[PDB]
Amino acid sequence: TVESNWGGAILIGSDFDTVSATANVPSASGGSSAAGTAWVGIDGDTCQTAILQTGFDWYGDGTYDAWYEWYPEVSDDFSGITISEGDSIQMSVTATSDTSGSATLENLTTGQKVSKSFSNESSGSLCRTNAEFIIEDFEECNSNGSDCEFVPFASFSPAVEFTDCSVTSDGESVSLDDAQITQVIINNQDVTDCSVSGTTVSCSYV
Amino acid sequence: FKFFLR
């Protein structure tokens, strides 16, 4: 099954404050339930207690969803925005403390913009030691967070690309050159081919 | 319900 569910760029550091990028909405197939998503966030890799993140997902039935999440709390979909094949989505998160922050999703194609703020989040605390641009095989569980299943990973195209990637550690821009590269791997085979070049993280389906 | 951890 799924051995590696994250594909993209992961920076390992400390005191990360902001992560932002713009990404395009691809088309997807593979069945009604197949899915995939693109997002930006802080923590979730070496730091497992929490994740500040936002992005959009895609399903094989042609549907889409823009969302935000403060893991370990369940994610939530945004109501004032639409996601359509080809749209360009500016996404960004800002951690203001280990328990507070905000997420913003802007559809540069439809000019729509949604946002969410977080304060005194008790579920979990950020370590702010990870920053990333990811394409993920995510999961579906019950409200609680148990009985989970990874969703079938939808094939997609064209390659989803994170552009104008920006990260800051205490106000200072951080180099995307130290970033680690991961691939979504299923059954010990890569199903993504992600790569970094300049300020662009590019991932295509394999 | 959707959950985004590595």
Side-chain angles (χ1 to χ4, degrees):
Chain A
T1 47
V2 194
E3 291 100 19
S4 174
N5 67 324
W6 274 31
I10 304 167
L11 284 166
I12 308 302
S14 61
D15 297 290
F16 292 112
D17 292 72
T18 306
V19 182
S20 308
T22 304
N24 56 117
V25 183
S27 52
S29 44
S32 295
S33 293
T37 184
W39 52 273
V40 297
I42 295 173
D43 295 329
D45 178 3
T46 60
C47 174
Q48 306 178 138
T49 52
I51 308 179
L52 198 212
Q53 51 176 347
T54 192
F56 53 94
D57 73 37
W58 52 76
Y59 274 77
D61 66 1
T63 55
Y64 291 102
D65 302 282
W67 54 265
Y68 65 79
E69 185 178 3
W70 178 292
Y71 182 87
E73 212 70 272
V74 65
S75 73
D76 221 274
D77 298 320
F78 278 115
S79 291
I81 184 173
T82 91
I83 279 63
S84 310
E85 190 180 325
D87 285 3
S88 189
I89 316 300
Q90 190 178 190
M91 333 171 287
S92 57
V93 291
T94 291
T96 53
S97 86
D98 291 355
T99 60
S100 64
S102 69
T104 309
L105 235 48
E106 182 169 352
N107 185 340
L108 300 183
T109 288
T110 71
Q112 307 179 85
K113 176 178 190 163
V114 292
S115 175
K116 181 76 176 73
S117 287
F118 307 83
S119 295
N120 296 299
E121 291 298 311
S122 314
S123 53
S125 302
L126 295 175
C127 316
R128 309 174 74 189
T129 48
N130 302 324
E132 62 273 345
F133 303 81
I134 307 296
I135 296 296
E136 175 181 31
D137 181 4
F138 58 97
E139 37 166 38
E140 286 181 35
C141 326
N142 45 42
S143 61
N144 183 307
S146 182
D147 300 310
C148 305
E149 284 294 12
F150 280 100
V151 301
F153 194 55
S155 65
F156 60 88
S157 60
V160 170
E161 314 179 74
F162 288 94
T163 52
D164 296 308
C165 297
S166 178
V167 178
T168 68
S169 187
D170 201 314
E172 331 169 302
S173 304
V174 180
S175 177
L176 202 68
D177 293 344
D178 288 297
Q180 234 72 201
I181 296 279
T182 181
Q183 309 292 164
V184 171
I185 298 171
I186 301 178
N187 281 158
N188 291 303
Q189 294 302 315
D190 294 9
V191 284
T192 60
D193 168 21
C194 291
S195 62
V196 176
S197 185
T199 66
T200 300
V201 175
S202 188
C203 298
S204 42
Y205 180 83
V206 176
Chain B
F1 303 83
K2 304 177 298 175
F3 283 80
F4 299 100
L5 222 44
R6 182 178 181 229

